[model samples]
Target: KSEIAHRFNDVGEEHFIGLVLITFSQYLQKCPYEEHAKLVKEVTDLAKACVADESAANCDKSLHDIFGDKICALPSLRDTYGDVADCCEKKEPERNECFLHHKDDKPDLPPFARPEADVLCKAFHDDEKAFFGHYLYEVARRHPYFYAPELLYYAQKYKAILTECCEAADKGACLTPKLDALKEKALISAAQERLRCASIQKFGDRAYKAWALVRLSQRFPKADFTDISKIVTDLTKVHKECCHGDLLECADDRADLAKYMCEHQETISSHLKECCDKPILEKAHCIYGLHNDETPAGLPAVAEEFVEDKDVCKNYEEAKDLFLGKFLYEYSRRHPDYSVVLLLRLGKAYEATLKKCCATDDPHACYAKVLDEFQPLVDEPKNLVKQNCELYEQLGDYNFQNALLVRYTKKVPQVSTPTLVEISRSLGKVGSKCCKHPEAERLPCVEDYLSVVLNRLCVLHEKTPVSEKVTKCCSESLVDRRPCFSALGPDETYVPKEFNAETFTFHADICTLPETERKIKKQTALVELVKHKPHATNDQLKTVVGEFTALLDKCCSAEDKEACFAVEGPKLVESSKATLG
Candidate 1:
């Protein structure tokens, strides 16, 4: 019996119980109690039999057979720690301790890096099980410190996504969003786990319990204060049970916390109602998917601790997402009206800036210089909505579409004509729908819909090589991408096809429309001018428009407008060539 206990100990309590939890959660969910106990004993007996074997090769094969049968096991165990002989040679307790130590001390272990999309796609297509095993190995190896159950959970979900995506025609497109969604959830869970662990390690069990109450209280401020107190009481009990390395208690207690929330959903926001309705196992993930509650009223803006005066590198190197997560919570609640997508963009922008600044010897100066543009970064979406809608109202649908096409074409001449036309058409649809909204709703409506267009452009742009401006713009998250595109200068490599002097000449009937109509008609002419003379600088184009307006002023007011234009149009085109050139 002590021998069996020693074998279980050899595997370590976390890995042993973690294996059972992973298997139960992933499969055998409906097993009877007797069968469950039988399976647990089988896992123990297998460990006992393997350790008793004298030859390391024999023990390794037995262990491999167990992993081959189950959907859960420590991946890359042999590759990470060379042979089982060193541990198997020792007696019970010493062997156990040696094995546990070996799991941690591998030299120069390579980190997990995802294969390129196409490579993964082909690999999955050719051999599904092999690909799945390799993926599990990759993630499990790099994250050796994570609970075995955590890695198993990630593996199963990712395999599900990979299978569905590989069968699709656009594998990268299908895979990226699903992968990003999974990544987002992992980051949330990992950050929370880090905070909990850090709190426990630094302040002791009692202090971490107290900190849990404070953390949960701040997380759900809308909950009844006393109700929050009761939930924390249960939570502290969970910590007491799980903190001492009881993986079984950890999994069960955490799931129970999800159930507790469901029982009293009234205390929390309506956002978690859907999560509560999910299956017991899935409920925790659904809860994690929620957006943070809005900043409680009357809170002051958070100072930039990760930037301004802080030792930004040390803080970031310790953990990047925790610092950013704090920023997200602080900034989001203070300005609850900001869209989550917009906030994500801001976080990404700050992360990118810090990555550059932190590498330099003088990080403070680098941060100061780059952060000068941070306000403008926050202002981008609102200002873009304002600017686009302002023009949309003036230009109307047909002309608005044409104007946008001209605008983007001139800005990104390297993009294909068909793709640009599609983008402009999509933006036009957004304008047509959003510009007509009630005065109060107009700007936000446009901002929301415009992001959809920019997101599509970003995806499409990824397929081909594009200008640096386009690449940088599309690199931004969806809300910020539109303004990034809006700020693009002319692509240096795309020399415009030259337009002849005759292309600048306009007919007399263009001036015959009603005063309001004629101004639009002339702007349509300006759009055409831009489409043809895309190489022209904004100042040069402005001069050309001014010259045309000047000619219109004289000809349209003349007694014989047609005859006047016939004489003056060629002369205007002749003089305009100099300015346009």
Candidate 2:
């Protein structure tokens, strides 16, 4: 059970465990007392196994990371219907199936806070200490996620104070002396530095409120007091003021509200429901456009649909892109390709396909539980671009295929239709020259020109290497090699122009350079990348660079660097990015 607890505790599968607990409760009724405890352990263990990262994360997490072989055994899923699914693109079905098998056994929401909002609001605001208590509770709910790294973070700090007071106070009155005795500790100090919450009133407001709540709970421990919108302005208008670029990122408010954020309908305008209703990126970026911190014009109506549930589908676009897709589609029609003006229409159409699939309440169902719902939707001309690119690839001009796939749509918000044709022609030149794949290798070759083809195939001339006579490391290194080779054209003094294919073009030069030069470039690209790219991470980037350097010494030759890099590179960067972007 301890093993299970550690595994599922943070995998976003709490709902699955909740179902197990429900099933356990049902079993408790039929069991005799002696077997009750035994059954409890069994259910608990099953729950843990269900949510484990690899399940073997708590057991056998062995992998020849350098050899692209992980030796970890996934958690036992005999009870989870035969497959312990990794939360990746491919295993989405196993996840849904397991959860659905136990759908009737699913967990309920946090016991409804025991208090109705109005009842809690009255209790929280009515008493002197109750108002303060309500404030304290609200304060902690919105505490910036980053603050946990600082000294005396409110999450643990409030925890310490509340728990201590809960233990010290007696039940009967909505007041307690033990809590009163600890009042001084509640106040955030007037003296502070290196932080955002600088106002003396708000700081003490939190502390005093925390202290007040401790006493309130001591007296009326069963009395519900969860409401705060009526009592505190900050919480009442959280969408407007609390979660702005100034206070904290919208994501800070969205940290643990996955189930609630996604399930709520738009009818409920309560702070929580409203906050959850907006599209995540729009809310995060909304504050940037606000001049005086008024709630920026929020996303369109559908933006609120299905915010969590990335497990819904790997390629599913968030609601924000769907709205943007519509905008771009409309923009493209008014200025057609022949008009010599074209909006960056590819992603616009691509996302429009996403919008069509995801606009409904049941996105996965609307797409028919089929994983291949991604389609071309930006106006009509976008398909022509894809058609030509495919034709170019058929002509053995895969570089045009590469350019077609990674056209940097965002970089060019709008382009003329003739220019799109021109761009296709230029890609024709590129593909015919650099990117050549036999019919057998075509499918595997052009998956992602930069991330996979250039970075990956160039690193490892594996069975599926993008090019011939290049890196022969792990074929898996394609997705894992970005931080090491981010810029398509950097290190100009060493790497010349015409060579700017992708950073994948640098491996040969990298092998020729001293470890000192390679390390410098790798370190620079890595730091900012791990900081910026959601998937990149410090530990991962470091491990990959280190492994590459070691592999260079061990197997890479002035004769052939690709032999070593492709193999080891993939495994080195396969670490978990769940905690990152």
Candidate 3:
């Protein structure tokens, strides 16, 4: 029964009860415990009622009936309610399976924090079931990848904490410090569990260690690629020593890693400065809370040559780990958008395919078959770009850039708003130059001319790792860059950061700038408008641009240009805002 429960834990709290009820319905029928059986039957009846509804809302309604109102109030669960309930369309076991497979890959928003200890305790004191249901829903969705049992363990831990505090004379004081400590423990444990799971369950020690090297190089880019590899090698050795060995030893080992990083780095990034200054034991947790530092400026470009020798299979056989490890590192450094897991799979596939082909009598024919097998994996980036171009043609300029901003911002939430803005503009520039071609020539035009826009960016950032997207894209040859950027996924995790809207605001001083500069500034305002109101139609955007044009002409022509623009520029901004809305 415990094993069965663990199997359904990944299915998510929304469908967990229903799956368990149906799976055990037969056994429940023969149970001699009348009261226990009656309780199970009552819950199962509600589960069936919801599952039979014409709409997915049936699941939510039934869950509310069982768990109470607070379940409906959890910010994370409420935001993702439709997504969790989406599996309601499937029948029986498949429905539960769908929930298990479902991932919150492109979340539009960041994770929500639990209410403060005082607020949480008050709610728990009011209704135990409601608090548990809400807690499970909130935690489970935030980490869709977490096992069900892991979530249940946290819930149980929190329950004890709140239960103890609620009965205390000073409830708030009792709850506050304990909750903070629990949050810290939760983070550290989750990190250790993930490492242990990957090391033991998925890749085992050797392969998992290899992946850590490839994965960490991209995470912490160094001027010399060799330095990055060396750091990861030393760090992963700690995992080898402690992954299945001792929990406390793992913590101390990781702290030593943080201590070494602080000592070795010439100048730590501003975010890590505080961590570096912390007491040795505290530094690891502080650094763990931050994102990896950007690749330092003056880092040399990766050389274009990967392996040009004719004896590829022979080279691999001599030193399989070194050969494949080098390939994985080079490919990952050049293509940060590609997930590490995907790259690992690609590396393993290459190794197996070569092994199989090398053993065959007709090695050439076996090699020829390899490309066909790999296409489904490698061709995704190229296909995504091709489809995006089709959308660009269908939507035209104004609508397309708006869509582009939304797509990138949602898909790569870790990217800053300013960077995403430039990326949207870059693609818009590509469309303007290429989409002018006729239908037959359009895709080729986009394909060939996109390099012009990308080349300028790469050259500017050749020595600097501005962001993972730019660093990875610039690492590739000009011809391959468009696909590299297209292939990249979001950062390994999202950090809840935002930019000021004032950064996008247009000003009256545009009238004083040169004609070329004036045109560029005006386009900035145009892109900014579309970003704020992505749903605004092409016609609506044009109307806003038309208003700007009229304002510019009127202000520029006036004898008192400054005064005229000062009066009219804000009016135009306000009018455009109203127009877009």
In the order shown, the candidates' Cα RMSDs to the true structure are 18.7, 28.4, 18.4
Residue ranges of candidate 1 with Cα displaced over 4 Å: 1-264, 271-295, 298-301, 304-317, 339-342, 345-374, 432-449, 466-469, 475-480, 491-493, 497-581
lDDT of 1 at 409: 79
User: Model 1 lDDT vs. the true structure?
Assistant: 0.57
> lDDT per prediction?
0.57, 0.31, 0.53
Model 2 TM-score?
A: 0.18
The TM-score-based order of candidates, best leading, equals: 1, 3, 2
Maximum-lDDT candidate: 1
Candidate 2 weakest lDDT stretch, 10 residues: 62-71
Error of 3 at 15 (Å): 40
| Clash-forming residue pairs, model 3 | 337-488
lDDT of 1 by residue, 114-176 (tens): 566888888878976556545544443332223333454666677789878887888889998
**Top candidate when judged by TM-score against the true structure:** 1
